[PDB]
Amino acid sequence: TRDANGTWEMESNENFEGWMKALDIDFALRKIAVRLTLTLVIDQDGDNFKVKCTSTFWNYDVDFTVGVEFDEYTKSLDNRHVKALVTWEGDVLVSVQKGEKENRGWKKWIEGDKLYLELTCGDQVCRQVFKKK
């Protein structure tokens, strides 16, 4: 349950608006983003990950190495500098993004066919579920 490789199609997405609002995403943009279908493509090779999140109007790409802190500029999101770090906690993949926002990051649980993703910012959690295509 440590293998996140694949093309992942969205099944559910709860509190997406609250999480985007916690990041200060423009209100008008949030209402469009709530309509867009999101696809998550992950390439995982040892510690090296390439993550690509795509919609009609929006893309979010990030590459990282597990265990290696990296400077991140969330240019397509809230446009902030964070110090990001992705590590394993048992079978959970955990990202912490140190910076202005508290409790910022995500956690991924892979259970065979399904990927559970919890994105956090401040007091908000967005819960997403994907199924491998």
Ligand X SMILES: *C/C=C/c1ccc2c(c1)C(C)(C)c1cc(N(CC)CC)ccc1-2
- The binding site for ligand X (CB under 6 A) comprises 20, 33, 38, 40, 51, 53, 55, 58-60, 77, 106, 108, 117, 119, 128
How far apart are CB 101 and ligand X at their closest, in Å? 14
Which residue, 56 or 100, is less far from ligand X as judged by CB?
56
Residue ranges of E strands in 46-104: 48-54, 59-65, 70-73, 81-89, 92-98
**87: closest CA among 49, 53, 50, 126?**
49
In the complex, what is the shortest distance from the CB of residue 58 to ligand X, in angstroms, rounded to a whole number? 4
C-beta nearest to ligand X: residue: 53
98: number of Cβ within 10 Å: 15
Nearer to ligand X, 15 or 55 (CB): 55
By C-beta, is 36 or 100 nearer to ligand X? 36
CA distance 48 to 85: 12
Which lies closer to ligand X via its Cβ, residue 57 or residue 102? 57
CB of 12 to ligand X, least distance (A): 12
How does DSSP assign 10-49, residue by residue? EEEEESHHHHHHHTT--HHHHHHHTTS--EEEEEEETTEE
